[PDB]
Amino acid sequence: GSHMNLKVEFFNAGTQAQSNSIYPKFRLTNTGSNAINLADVKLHYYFTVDGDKAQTFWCDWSPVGSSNVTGTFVKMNPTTTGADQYLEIAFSSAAGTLAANTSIEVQGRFAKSDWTNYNQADDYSFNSSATTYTSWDKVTAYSAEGLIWGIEP
Ligand SMILES: [Ca+2]
Numbered sequence: 001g002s003h004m005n006l007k008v009e010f011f012n013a014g015t016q017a018q019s020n021s022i023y024p025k026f027r028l029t030n031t032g033s034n035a036i037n038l039a040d041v042k043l044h045y046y047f048t049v050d051g052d053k054a055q056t057f058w059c060d061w062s063p064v065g066s067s068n069v070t071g072t073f074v075k076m077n078p079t080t081t082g083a084d085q086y087l088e089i090a091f092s093s094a095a096g097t098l099a100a101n102t103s104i105e106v107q108g109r110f111a112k113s114d115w116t117n118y119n120q121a122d123d124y125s126f127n128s129s130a131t132t133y134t135s136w137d138k139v140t141a142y143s144a145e146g147l148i149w150g151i152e153p
């Protein structure tokens with residue numbers, strides 16, 4: 001109809017296989033005519049942790065205000081190919097609405113508490129090739145209604 005009209009594009013800002021950080025960059029576009037409430041929107045980035053440690057997500061930039069964008073880490077259960085964990089990005093109510101036919105970027109990083117390495121190469125959501133925003137079905141997005149973009153592992 002016209003309520004989950006959220007286009008999701010993605011790329012990795014850093015593509016080193018052995019990397020102490022992962023650098024997800026999303027661009028979300030409201031392709032409908034009705035405004036989208038960002039507070040109900042979640043994003044997932046799926047990966048293998050390569051040595052589990054407490055992790056932190058920082059949103060460095062988003063037009064909606066980086067402090068309104070936060071991340072938590074959840075274990076996949078059961079684990080599967082390319083995915084034993086996911087980052088889940090959420091928006092606060094202060095993030096506001098995304099207008100019809102407008103887009104916002106969500107640029108962030110995450111790392112382990114001890115700054116030890118990931119191997120990005122085997123990560124479900126990792127795009128080793130893209131150097132700018134691409135239509136990527138290996139990250140997912142959600143509204144209040146559930147999945148609205150992508151293929152869960
Ligand atoms: Ca990995």
Ligand code: NI
Pocket residue numbers: 001002003004005
């Ligand atoms: Ni709809």
